[PDB]
């Protein structure tokens, strides 16, 4: 229903649709963890060795053998169970404990439940309508002509990532740079590509899922006995595409910051892995990748990755999720469709983000919610 003379005002930085999506995702996520196994019994002393019988050297410090005592009956009859763990999940007290047993409850993700993103459309309730801009080269803010109506938004996949924006959608013609306060270095800059950069990621290790009885109808999923060579997880990123993509970004940054200056890209900054590395979970396992190999320039690329099983979902503390191991190997392909950047004459840009909402805000910059109020008056010729 194109609205021929409508020039409506938008502000993506105040879009409550983003806030709703954030809240809804968290709620769905949390309710999916009510059933299935709680892992309190794993908060025991572990006895760990370094797992070195079939490794490449770059993986030498990554796995722990960790033997421990756990039971199946309230019989005071514990059994030895061992599981390999990634180093990032285990902290030294030879004796070790799981990293989160000091601060939070650990819940096993239920292995039969998938979180694979499916595009979701948001639809207006009766009495409401969604308006959108069709303009190209739109700021995401301010007025726009060529406003049309929406019953349901286009579908958006609820992909959660850090630093790089994956999948979602592409800009209509040229990479777009959008920000709330462009001259304010305290804000994130959302950059939307007009063409994807293809990224191939993998966990090239043929693993085994080990089912451990933990209680009366309860199972714990252990991992171990990896078949074949143990190798480091990684992403390949096509190199030429990445370089061309930055050239486009640089040109647009210059339009905003001056076409007579020089900018560079730095390897982000310090902080926790949830902040400093690229994060995604394809295949069901959580990957943390080093983007220092991408953001290194002044105006294939293999990115090493680490894997964690105990995840503190960004949205809160006091709880942790345990991701069961995935049987076999993981391979996935995705589209980098944008960046979350911050800025520190010349200027320097760094990968940032980490706030889950930026991954939806970057899609919901075209839609606005309004209430219909179909009653009014006017002077005219109309006498009882």
């Amino acid at each position, epitope marked *: 229903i194109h609205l021929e003379n409508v020039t409506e005002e938008f502000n993506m930085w105040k879009n409550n649709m983003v806030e709703q999506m954030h809240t809804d995702i968290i709620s769905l996520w949390d309710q999916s963890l009510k059933p299935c196994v709680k892992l309190t019994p794993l908060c025991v002393t572990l006895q760990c060795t370094n797992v070195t*019988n079939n490794i*490449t*050297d770059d993986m030498r410090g990554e796995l722990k053998n960790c033997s421990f005592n756990m039971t199946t009956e309230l019989r005071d009859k514990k059994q030895k169970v061992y599981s390999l763990f990634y180093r990032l999940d285990v902290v030294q007290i030879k004796e070790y404990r799981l990293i989160n047993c000091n601060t939070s409850a650990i819940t096993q993700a239920c292995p039969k439940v998938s979180f694979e993103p499916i595009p979701i459309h948001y639809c207006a309730p009766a009495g409401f309508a969604i308006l959108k801009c069709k303009d190209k080269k739109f700021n995401g803010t301010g007025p726009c002509p060529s406003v049309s109506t929406v019953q349901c938004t286009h579908g958006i996949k609820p992909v959660v990532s850090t630093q790089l924006l994956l999948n979602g959608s592409l800009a209509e013609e040229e990479v777009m740079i959008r920000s709330e306060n462009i001259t304010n270095n305290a804000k994130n800059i959302l950059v939307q590509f007009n063409t994807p950069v293809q990224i191939n990621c993998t966990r090239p290790n043929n693993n085994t899922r080990k089912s451990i009885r933990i209680g009366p109808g309860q199972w714990f999923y252990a991992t171990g006995d990896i078949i074949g060579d143990i190798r480091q997880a990684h992403c390949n990123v096509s190199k030429a595409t990445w370089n061309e993509t930055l050239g486009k970004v640089v040109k647009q940054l210059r339009k905003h910051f001056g076409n007579n200056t020089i900018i560079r890209f730095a390897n982000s900054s310090g902080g926790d892995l949830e902040v400093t590395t690229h994060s995604f979970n394809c295949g069901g396992e959580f990957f943390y990748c080093n983007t220092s190999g991408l953001f290194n320039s002044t105006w294939s690329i293999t990115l090493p990755c680490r894997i964690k099983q105990i995840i503190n979902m960004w949205q809160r503390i006091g709880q942790a999720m345990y991701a069961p191991p995935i049987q076999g190997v993981i391979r996935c392909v995705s589209n980098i469709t944008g960046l979350i950047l911050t800025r520190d004459t010349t200027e320097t840009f760094r990968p940032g983000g980490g706030d889950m909402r930026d991954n939806w805000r970057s899609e919901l910059y075209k839609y606005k919610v309004v209430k219909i109020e179909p009653l009014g008056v006017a002077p005219t010729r109309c006498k009882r």
Partner: antibody
Amino acid sequence: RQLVESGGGLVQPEGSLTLTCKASGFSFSRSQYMCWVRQAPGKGLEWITCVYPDDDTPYYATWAKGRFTISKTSSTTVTLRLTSLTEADTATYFCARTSGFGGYSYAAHGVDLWGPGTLV
Amino acid sequence: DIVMTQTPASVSEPVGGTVTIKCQASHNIRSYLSWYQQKVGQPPKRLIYETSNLASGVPSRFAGSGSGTEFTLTISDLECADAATYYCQSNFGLSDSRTYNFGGGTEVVVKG
């Protein structure tokens, strides 16, 4: 950067000795892998043992497992303890360093540096 | 556990000739084999670090190839200076059994 062996000299049957090798000019690091190889004066070369300096894991040839011990003693030195010596073990012993790939053994390129051999 | 056999144990060829040196492994070693040249009184020099890839400073005359369990050198333009014992080294790795068996070698005599 040169490996230098010491502790040579022949020892009578059923005796023991320990060989010493120093990294003159360098320290051990994760890309380096240290090994010992011996060559009897009338023979080719026989691999004995290796150690990886970041966690000091020893590796041994089956024939050597019950007689030879390899151990790191410093960031620049390693030693090899030899016991139950026989006259058949008379050989020139070499200290050597290998290199390789992070993606597959930092030894998968073989020896880039050899010390002068020392005979016992 | 992986053992390599050399052949011919020894050869003799006039200066300017070419020698083929063969090494046969008991197991597939995924082309990680290295080759060495030993002069009398010296530790062996590395010629090849990875099947066909020559070590720095080594002339192209020492090129070689192979796959699987079968590897060879073809050393061309032999000089009396090139007479040496040549050796085949396994370098398989990964396991905790390792055993980087140094295989046997061959004697190459270059005749003037």
